[PDB]
Design a protein around this nucleic acid. Structure first.
Ligand SMILES: Nc1ncnc2c1ncn2[C@@H]1O[C@H](COP(=O)(O)OP(=O)(O)OP(=O)(O)O)[C@@H](O)[C@H]1O
Ligand SMILES: [Mg+2]
Length: 342
DNA sequence: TTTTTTTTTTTTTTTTTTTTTTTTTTTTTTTTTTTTTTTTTTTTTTTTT
């Protein structure tokens, strides 16, 4: 409601925001402004920034196609203690219209909708669940893996078609569920073991993994230098970019910027999809489907929107590719087996 | 012994019927009683030779 309000920014504010957008590293600054208390998960924070910006809403209505999902769905898969729940908590406490779900505490009808009897009118009324209450926001699903397939099938239609068709006893409709999904999950065996391939170790239905457009592998390097740096950050946390500018920057980008693909961006996307499909066709890697091309499109549009660009260019597609590869650690992945360490 | 579908099964109600309980409610005649008449049976002041 605020972002749609025409006089939300003074001219001074708009000029300051545009001056920020001209900075070479506005992307990194805005990403680093997120979850400032979390130590160097720069790629996860960039992905979450892109999720907060989101892709370009499109009207495919005259194409027979249906509704295209402009939302970015991120999955954080990693061994415990790596601060996934802290990131989900930060996004939960930062966005309007968000929901937090964890594990077995949610059901399928508790995420979609159900009938209760309003105890002020003595009338049965329909109540929405977590996935509809975040219809234009982010639903944070924690312990994604410790969550039974009954309720995780509900996510398929939400993540593909942004709608929630319910055909119950009397009530038939299509609730809107245009949510972004930020999911955090543990590997099978709750700890990444290096003897198993990525697919064997994430252990999610392979159709469901294609719905996420970033899978960040939050793996622990047995690295002593990182141990020391993280230890200093955490201990320093026991004794001692603005937000308002970030807030207004994102609001301005949502209001005014509608990135459109340029011809050379189009070509970059074609090449990127073909290459990524060659790469992911290996043994136990997360494969690429035509849905990952749209993942790239969404990420590129979001990145162009970070620049206040209004035009998607090769740099946006390049950053989409890079983010997609860094998540999943595809540089550390051989085309035969799992990964090792960075 | 990790994952997974029938099975209830306790909890929300809703229906829903059958049964017991609840809620509502002045007018109209009649009759005794008192206070009057009214015909009749006395009875108490009138007068005569
Ligand atoms: N890189 C990091 N930056 C900041 N804090 C961290 C980092 N890694 C770990 N921590 C701290 O360690 C704790 C990790 O717990 P958290 O719930 O965030 O992890 P998690 O990934 O959800 O674990 P699990 O997979 O078991 O759910 C948090 O208190 C967090 O503050
Ligand atoms: Mg957690």
């Amino acid at each position: 409601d605020e972002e749609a309000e025409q006089k939300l920014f003074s001219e001074k504010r708009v000029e300051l925001l545009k001056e920020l957008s001209r900075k070479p590293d506005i992307y990194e600054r805005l990403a680093s402004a997120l979850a400032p208390s979390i130590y160097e998960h720069e790629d996860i924070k960039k992905g979450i920034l892109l999720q907060l910006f989101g892709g370009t809403r499109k009207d495919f209505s005259h194409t027979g196609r249906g509704k295209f999902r402009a939302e970015i769905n991120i999955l954080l898969c990693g061994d415990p203690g790596t601060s996934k729940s802290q990131l989900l908590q930060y996004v939960y406490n930062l966005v309007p219209r968000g929901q937090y779900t964890s594990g077995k505490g949610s059901s399928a009808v508790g995420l979609t909708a159900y009938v209760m009897k309003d105890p002020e009118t003595r009338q049965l009324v329909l109540q929405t669940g977590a996935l509809v209450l975040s219809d234009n926001g982010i639903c944070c699903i924690d312990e994604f893996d410790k969550m039974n397939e009954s309720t995780r099938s509900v996510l398929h239609e939400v993540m593909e078609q942004q709608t929630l068709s319910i055909a119950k006893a009397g009530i038939i409709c299509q609730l809107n569920a245009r949510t972004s999904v930020l999911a955090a999950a543990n590997p099978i065996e709750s700890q990444w073991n290096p003897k198993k391939t990525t697919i064997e170790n994430i252990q999610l239905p392979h159709t469901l993994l294609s719905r996420f457009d970033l899978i960040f592998l939050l793996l622990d390097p047995q690295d002593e230098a990182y141990d020391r740096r993280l230890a200093h950050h955490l201990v320093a946390l026991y004794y001692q970019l603005d937000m308002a500018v970030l807030k207004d920057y994102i609001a301005y980008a949502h209001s005014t910027i509608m990135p459109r693909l340029s011809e050379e961006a189009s070509q970059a996307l074609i090449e990127a999809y073909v290459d990524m499909r060659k790469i992911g066709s290996s043994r136990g890697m997360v494969s690429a489907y035509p849905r990952q091309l749209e993942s790239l499109i969404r990420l590129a549009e979001a990145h162009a929107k970070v620049r206040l660009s209004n035009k998607v260019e090769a740099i946006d597609v390049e950053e989409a590719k890079r983010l997609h590869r860094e998540a999943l650690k595809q540089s550390a992945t051989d085309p035969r087996t799992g990964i090792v360490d960075i």
